[PDB]
């Protein structure tokens, strides 16, 4: 009977935990935890939530191979 | 072997005043090249070794040539001594015995007689990749001959000191390509393969909350690594091939060893039990999966088991694992029409250890070996004997890993 607007994010559980860490560091990110592979996230952050993801997967991967 | 005469042609070119490094596989006959050079020079030859088994092998090569008992071929060790004679000599010494500092067991004078009387003329250093260290610089600083030779199999290290050997002993003269040698002699085809196993959520968040070497205790103890490990073990046992499991960590080797119910060899282990496990691996067909640590790999390499599994690993020591892997690969030679050697690297996604194992695979690319990635071989879903496949066993294993973190 209620309807709220958000951003449905579908990803693997590891990326879900990473997004929960983004919400744990910056706040005002994740609105709800739907299941193991979905999340309700503030739309105005999605691009950021994406870009930061790249950053946190750029700090994790390393691999300069030089 | 043709490449051995290709190396001896350089000695046949100039003759006098020469020094360099010759790269030959462990399965090749570099000791035969040392014997031939000793026959060409005919002088007091000293062979620097780090283990007594290599001394016994060099003595066996001396027996393959001629003479060892008469007062000419000497033996230097911490147990006994043997006299020598000029104009011709063959002796093997230990790095730790010649180095030392002030500890003495009334034997450093016996070495300072071989170094004081000036009975030399040919230098042979086994495994030159270990030379980058102060003790070896002291050994070179306490010796001086007319011709020097460096027998080694590898030289990949990240200490940025391998280039110094170009002036400490001499620049590398001949580097044999292991692929062309594989065409000359089937030294087991190298199939490099990384197994990408999924990572659970709890071990992922706990893995991120951990750091340093403690997070390795959360990277190895992943349930999917146990499931894929059992799948590879049962698969190789179904193919009728023996399995060798490597692990840089002793605790993980004991965990997988006790959970798989197979013999294990690690540090502080009695030598009689090690020899018993070796004989059971050589003769008993019921033991086709052994768990070997660095002690079981550096001391002895067996020509059996075409299945090599890698689980535990340490940061930076990827080149050493590539050298040991190369030793197990070169140790398997018998000229077979098939002869497919399989190296598996059990790695989990989003972990800090796979990104160094990729550097190890880069070392495996520099050698010309073939590398391919493997996400998952279909067949593990049909194995009901897999452990830690149920959420109950995954939670219990999680509690065990948490207790292990509380102990460390």
From Swiss-Prot, chain A:
GO terms for biological process: nucleotide-excision repair; nucleotide-excision repair, preincision complex assembly; transcription by RNA polymerase II; transcription initiation at RNA polymerase II promoter. InterPro entries: TFB5-like_sf, TFIIH_TTDA/Tfb5. Pfam families: Tfb5. It is found in: Nucleus. GO terms for cellular component: cytosol; nucleus; transcription factor TFIIH core complex; transcription factor TFIIH holo complex. The keyword Transcription regulation applies. SMART domains: Tbf5. It comes from the Eukaryota. Its main location: nucleus. SUPFAM superfamilies: TFB5-like. Keywords: DNA damage, DNA repair, Nucleus, Transcription, Transcription regulation. Component of the general transcription and DNA repair factor IIH (TFIIH) core complex, which is involved in general and transcription-coupled nucleotide excision repair (NER) of damaged DNA and, when complexed to TFIIK, in RNA transcription by RNA polymerase II. In NER, TFIIH acts by opening DNA around the lesion to allow the excision of the damaged oligonucleotide and its replacement by a new DNA fragment. In transcription, TFIIH has an essential role in transcription initiation. PANTHER family: GENERAL TRANSCRIPTION FACTOR IIH SUBUNIT 5. Component of the 7-subunit TFIIH core complex composed of XPB/SSL2, XPD/RAD3, SSL1, TFB1, TFB2, TFB4 and TFB5, which is active in NER. The core complex associates with the 3-subunit CTD-kinase module TFIIK composed of CCL1, KIN28 and TFB3 to form the 10-subunit holoenzyme (holo-TFIIH) active in transcription. An additionnal subunit, TFB6, plays a role in the dissociation of the SSL2 helicase from TFIIH after transcription initiation. Interacts with TFB2. Belongs to the TFB5 family. This is General transcription and DNA repair factor IIH subunit TFB5.
From Swiss-Prot, chain B:
The modification Phosphoserine is found at residue 390. ATP binds at residues 24-31. It is found in: Nucleus. Disruption phenotype: Essential, it cannot be deleted; epistasis studies suggest it is involved in damaged DNA excision repair. It comes from the Eukaryota. A motif (DEAH box) lies at residues 126-129. Residues 227-381 form the Helicase C-terminal domain. Present with 825 molecules/cell in log phase SD medium. Belongs to the helicase family. RAD25/XPB subfamily. ATP-dependent DNA translocase. Component of the general transcription and DNA repair factor IIH (TFIIH) core complex. When complexed to CDK-activating kinase (CAK), involved in RNA transcription by RNA polymerase II. May have 3'-5' helicase activity alone, the TFIIH core however has no 3'-5' helicase activity. Also involved in transcription-coupled nucleotide excision repair (NER) of damaged DNA. In NER, TFIIH acts by opening DNA around the lesion to allow the excision of the damaged oligonucleotide and its replacement by a new DNA fragment. Component of the 7-subunit TFIIH core complex composed of XPB/SSL2, XPD/RAD3, SSL1, TFB1, TFB2, TFB4 and TFB5, which is active in NER. The core complex associates with the 3-subunit CTD-kinase module TFIIK composed of CCL1, KIN28 and TFB3 to form the 10-subunit holoenzyme (holo-TFIIH) active in transcription. An additionnal subunit, TFB6, plays a role in the dissociation of the SSL2 helicase from TFIIH after transcription initiation. Interacts directly with TFB6. This is General transcription and DNA repair factor IIH helicase/translocase subunit XPB/SSL2. It comes from Saccharomyces cerevisiae (strain ATCC 204508 / S288c) (Baker's yeast). The chain holds residues 363 to 770 of 843 of the full protein.
């Amino acid at each position: 009977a209620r309807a709220r607007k958000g951003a449905l994010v579908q990803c693997d559980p590891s990326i879900k935990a990473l997004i929960l860490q983004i919400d744990a560091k910056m706040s005002d990110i994740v609105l709800e935890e739907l299941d193991d592979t979905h999340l309700l996230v503030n739309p105005s952050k999605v691009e950021f939530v994406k870009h930061e993801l790249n950053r946190l997967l750029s700090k994790n991967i390393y691999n300069p191979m030089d | 072997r043709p490449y051995q005469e290709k190396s001896l042609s350089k000695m046949f070119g100039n003759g006098r005043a020469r020094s360099g490094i010759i790269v030959l596989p462990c399965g090749a006959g570099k000791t035969l090249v040392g014997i031939t050079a000793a026959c060409t020079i005919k002088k007091s030859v000293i062979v620097l070794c780090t283990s007594s088994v290599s001394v016994m092998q060099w003595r066996q090569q001396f027996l393959x040539x001629x003479x060892x008992x008469x007062x000419x071929x000497x033996x230097x060790x911490x147990x006994x001594x043997x006299x020598x004679x000029x104009x011709x000599x063959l002796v093997v010494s230990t790095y730790s015995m010649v180095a030392n500092x002030x500890x003495x067991x009334x034997x450093x004078x016996x070495x300072x007689x071989x170094x004081x009387x000036x009975x030399w003329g040919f230098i042979i250093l086994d495994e030159v990749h270990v030379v980058p260290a102060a003790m070896f610089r002291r050994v070179v600083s306490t010796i001086a001959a007319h011709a020097k030779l460096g027998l080694t199999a590898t030289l990949v290290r990240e200490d940025d000191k391998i280039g110094d050997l170009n002036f400490l002993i001499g620049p590398k003269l001949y580097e044999a390509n292991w692929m062309e040698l594989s065409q000359k002699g089937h030294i087991a085809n190298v199939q490099c393969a990384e197994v990408w196993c999924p990572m659970t959520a709890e071990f992922y968040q706990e893995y991120l909350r951990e750091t340093a070497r403690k997070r390795m205790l959360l990277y190895i103890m992943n349930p999917t690594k146990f499931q894929a490990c059992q799948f590879l073990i049962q698969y190789h046992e179904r193919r009728g091939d023996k399995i060798i499991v490597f692990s840089d960590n002793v605790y993980a080797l004991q965990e997988y060893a006790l959970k798989m119910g197979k013999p294990f060899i690690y540090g502080s282990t009695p030598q009689q039990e090690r020899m018993n496990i070796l004989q059971n691996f050589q003769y008993n067909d019921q033991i086709n999966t052994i768990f070997l640590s660095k002690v079981g790999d550096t001391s002895i390499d067996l020509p059996e088991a075409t299945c090599l599994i890698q689980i535990s690993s340490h940061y930076g020591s990827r080149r050493q694992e590539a050298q040991r892997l190369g030793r197990i690969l070169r140790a398997k030679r018998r000229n077979d029409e098939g002869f497919n050697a399989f190296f598996y690297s059990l790695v989990s996604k989003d972990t800090q250890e796979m990104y160094y194992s990729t550097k190890r695979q880069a070392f495996l690319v520099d050698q010309g070996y073939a590398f391919k990635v493997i996400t998952h071989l279909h067949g593990m879903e049909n194995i009901p004997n897999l452990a830690y496949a149920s959420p109950r066993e995954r939670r219990e294993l999680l509690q065990e890993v948490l207790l292990k973190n509380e102990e460390a």
